[PDB]
Amino acid sequence: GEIAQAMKEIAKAMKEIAWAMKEIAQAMKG
Amino acid sequence: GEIAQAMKEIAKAMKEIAWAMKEIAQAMKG
Amino acid sequence: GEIAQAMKEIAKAMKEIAWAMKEIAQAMKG
Amino acid sequence: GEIAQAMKEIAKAMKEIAWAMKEIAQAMKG
Amino acid sequence: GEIAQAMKEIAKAMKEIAWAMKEIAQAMKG
Amino acid sequence: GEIAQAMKEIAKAMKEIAWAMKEIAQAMKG
Amino acid sequence: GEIAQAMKEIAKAMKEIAWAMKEIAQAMKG
């Protein structure tokens, strides 16, 4: 449905944004 | 469909933000 | 209504943020 | 009500974040 | 209630993020 | 309940993101 | 349920994004 599917897509995108931010943090850590 | 339409646009926008953050992470990773 | 109006304004903002993140990613892409 | 007021504040902040992100994209655009 | 409190805290935090993004945009403008 | 817990965790995280983004803005401010 | 599981995944991702943003803020301060 309209609400459940939109929430599942938000969750998948948020997990990918977290993975990318962790890579950027690791590049800038010494 | 004001709530359904907002949630669909938020979900698509978050998928595009996730693609872009993965590209930036890939540019910055060793 | 104030909740439908806020959801609509959040969706339009998220679309603008996605456009901006794509421009930045394109600038940084090798 | 507090839930309606919180949503309206989140919408106003998201609009400001969209404006800033477009300025940053304009500075890095080629 | 815990849900109304969570939404109030989300709103205050997004207002602070919008302030910080405007500062970063002013630094990079030009 | 798990939905109330999720909202509390999202609020705590948004406060930490807002704190971090103000430190980044301070570093970038002349 | 899919909506409860999406909310739990959004909270875990937001907590990881908060950790990453504080590591980046640490890199950028004395």
Author numbering:
A (entry chain F), B (entry chain C), C (entry chain G), D (entry chain E), E (entry chain A), F (entry chain B), ...: 1 to 30
Paste lines from the article.
αHBs are oligomers of 5 or more α-helical peptides that assemble into coiled-coil structures with central solvent-accessible channels. We targeted two properties of αHBs: oligomeric state, which directly affects the internal diameter of the channel; and the identities of channel-facing residues, which fine tune this dimension and introduce different chemistries. The αHBs are loaded with an environment sensitive dye (in this case, 1,6-diphenyl-1,3,5-hexatriene, DPH) that binds within the channels and fluoresces. Accordingly, challenging the array with analytes leads to differential displacement of the dye across the array to give a fluorescent fingerprint.
